[PDB]
Amino acid sequence: SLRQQVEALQGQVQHLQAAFSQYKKVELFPNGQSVGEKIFKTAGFVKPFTEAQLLCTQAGGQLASPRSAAENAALQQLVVAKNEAAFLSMTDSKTEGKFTYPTGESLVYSNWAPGEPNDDGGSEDCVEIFTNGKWNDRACGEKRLVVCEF
Amino acid sequence: ASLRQQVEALQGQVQHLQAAFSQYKKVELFPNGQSVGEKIFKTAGFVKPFTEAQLLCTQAGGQLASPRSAAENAALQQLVVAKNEAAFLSMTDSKTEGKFTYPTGESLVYSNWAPGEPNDDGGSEDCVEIFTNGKWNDRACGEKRLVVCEF
Amino acid sequence: ASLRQQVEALQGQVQHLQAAFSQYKKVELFPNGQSVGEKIFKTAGFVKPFTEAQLLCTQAGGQLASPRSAAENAALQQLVVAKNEAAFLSMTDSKTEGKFTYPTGESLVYSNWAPGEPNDDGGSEDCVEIFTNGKWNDRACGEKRLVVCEF
Ligand SMILES: O=P([O-])([O-])O[C@@H]1[C@H](O)[C@H](O)[C@@H](O)[C@H](O)[C@H]1O
Ligand SMILES: O=P([O-])([O-])O[C@@H]1[C@H](O)[C@H](O)[C@@H](O)[C@H](O)[C@H]1O
Ligand SMILES: [Ca+2]
Ligand SMILES: [Ca+2]
Ligand SMILES: [Ca+2]
Ligand SMILES: [Ca+2]
Numbered sequence: 001s002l003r004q005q006v007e008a009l010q011g012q013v014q015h016l017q018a019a020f021s022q023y024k025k026v027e028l029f030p031n032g033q034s035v036g037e038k039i040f041k042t043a044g045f046v047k048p049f050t051e052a053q054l055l056c057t058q059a060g061g062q063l064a065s066p067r068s069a070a071e072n073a074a075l076q077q078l079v080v081a082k083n084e085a086a087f088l089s090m091t092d093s094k095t096e097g098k099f100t101y102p103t104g105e106s107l108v109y110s111n112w113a114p115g116e117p118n119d120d121g122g123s124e125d126c127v128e129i130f131t132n133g134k135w136n137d138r139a140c141g142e143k144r145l146v147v148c149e150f
Numbered sequence: 151a152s153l154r155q156q157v158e159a160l161q162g163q164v165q166h167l168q169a170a171f172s173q174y175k176k177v178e179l180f181p182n183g184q185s186v187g188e189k190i191f192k193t194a195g196f197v198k199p200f201t202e203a204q205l206l207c208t209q210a211g212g213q214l215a216s217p218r219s220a221a222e223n224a225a226l227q228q229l230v231v232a233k234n235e236a237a238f239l240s241m242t243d244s245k246t247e248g249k250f251t252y253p254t255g256e257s258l259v260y261s262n263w264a265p266g267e268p269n270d271d272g273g274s275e276d277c278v279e280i281f282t283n284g285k286w287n288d289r290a291c292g293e294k295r296l297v298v299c300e301f
Numbered sequence: 302a303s304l305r306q307q308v309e310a311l312q313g314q315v316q317h318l319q320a321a322f323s324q325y326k327k328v329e330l331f332p333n334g335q336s337v338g339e340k341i342f343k344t345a346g347f348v349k350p351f352t353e354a355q356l357l358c359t360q361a362g363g364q365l366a367s368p369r370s371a372a373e374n375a376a377l378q379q380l381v382v383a384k385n386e387a388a389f390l391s392m393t394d395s396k397t398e399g400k401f402t403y404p405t406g407e408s409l410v411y412s413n414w415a416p417g418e419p420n421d422d423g424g425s426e427d428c429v430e431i432f433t434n435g436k437w438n439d440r441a442c443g444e445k446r447l448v449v450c451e452f
């Protein structure tokens with residue numbers, strides 16, 4: 001009576017494990033990347049920073065925020081796949097020359113291209129990631145690939 | 151006894167799936183879905199005439215967007231705004247002019263008509279579109295609108 | 302007794318998880334996937350040459366579309382019709398000319414060749430495309446076709 005109910009529940013949970021694992025692969029193809037506990041997903045279109053940031057937040061995530069080389073490499077795969085540089089979440093909008101996450105926390109990882117960040121024209125407060133994975137500071141009003149993290 | 155061991159094992163398995171799946175729900179709905187209550191809207195991201203749109207949703211195991219409250223209507227409008235394209239709703243007055251019904255044939259429980267609508271303009275508007283401002287307008291079914299299904 | 306309350310609780314949780322998962326699965330497949338039996342096809346929605354397409358699917362944990370029955374073929378055909386783009390299948394006769402095999406090296410168990418196919422045209426066609434009518438043609442692997450993976 002119990003041992004039988006438990007057997008049935010075991011069957012249900014085993015099915016769910018199999019079905020969920022299949023579904024994860026389907027979901028991530030072709031626009032997602034799983035790295036550790038984080039998932040990057042591209043919207044597959046470009047927006048200016050403010051609009052990109054709102055899209056991610058409204059979706060219950062935030063803009064791509066790579067915090068290690070492995071996360072950066074995973075994000076880089078999407079950028080390469082779409083062949084479009086992407087916005088990161090980080091900006092020095094508050095204090096010029098100091099890049100912060102959306103929390104106001106200072107950077108725990110960076111991958112700046114040589115000579116960057118350079119605030120070119122005195123007006124680069126957002127960050128793009130190139131197909132080579134390197135970062136450049138860029139004007140926030142430019143349109144870049146939208147990639148959120150969950 | 152061994153029935154207890156199995157339970158605590160299962161509890162761990164269900165907790166893992168619950169956590170893992172919660173993350174995937176958010177990932178899935180970005181950028182083309184909107185959850186509202188127990189309903190999920192999902193856009194195909196392109197336009198079709200009504201008959202084609204209706205068939206796409208039905209074959210996918212759902213139906214055309216059928217907002218049944220202000221909340222559902224606002225959630226749908228978010229997609230329409232995001233895509234910048236008016237969308238078809240499920241409801242028509244094809245059977246009885248002036249009487250809009252769901253695919254089931256049930257009368258409307260909610261509507262958000264723009265002022266003066268529905269007006270059966272030209273004597274030939276039996277479908278319904280939702281605009282970027284959330285308001286509804288009867289429109290010819292042969293026109294192409296954003297395909298948004300509900301599941 | 303307490304164990305019974307726990308089994309009861311966990312089963313309600315699992316059944317709620319089952320229902321939510323089933324809903325999210327329908328949403329996931331619309332409009333770029335098709336489920337048939339235990340298999341799921343999903344298109345990337347762009348074209349690539351065969352080697353590039355095959356790598357995309359392998360890297361994603363699946364393989365190129367490999368229809369093994371009329372039912373599987375028909376499900377795949379829906380996606381091809383939807384995108385209006387012929388797709389590559391997984392199968393090649395690269396090893397032994399005229400002998401098409403799955404990635405494992407197994408001989409075909411099902412085929413749906415268009416009349417006169419496979420013909421190895423130019424004496425150089427070792428990949429397989431599926432047309433919008435669901436029929437197959439051998440095609441040079443260097444050509445670009447719709448990417449559809451199976452999982
Ligand atoms: O404006 P532009 O000379 O085409 O491009 C700039 C340069 O590549 C510069 O090295 C970089 O630091 C700037 O962020 C870019 O805007
Ligand atoms: O076709 P059109 O004359 O540009 O526009 C019409 C008008 O906007 C009318 O107010 C509305 O009720 C009709 O549904 C539309 O078709
Ligand atoms: Ca500044
Ligand atoms: Ca700056
Ligand atoms: Ca710069
Ligand atoms: Ca009429």
Ligand SMILES: [Ca+2]
Nearest residue numbers: 243270275276
């Ligand atoms: Ca009418």
Ligand SMILES: [Ca+2]
Nearest residue numbers: 269271287288
């Ligand atoms: Ca009207």
Ligand SMILES: [Ca+2]
Nearest residue numbers: 398425426427
């Ligand atoms: Ca050959």
Ligand SMILES: [Ca+2]
Nearest residue numbers: 394421426427
């Ligand atoms: Ca050949």
Ligand SMILES: [Ca+2]
Nearest residue numbers: 420422438439
């Ligand atoms: Ca041929």
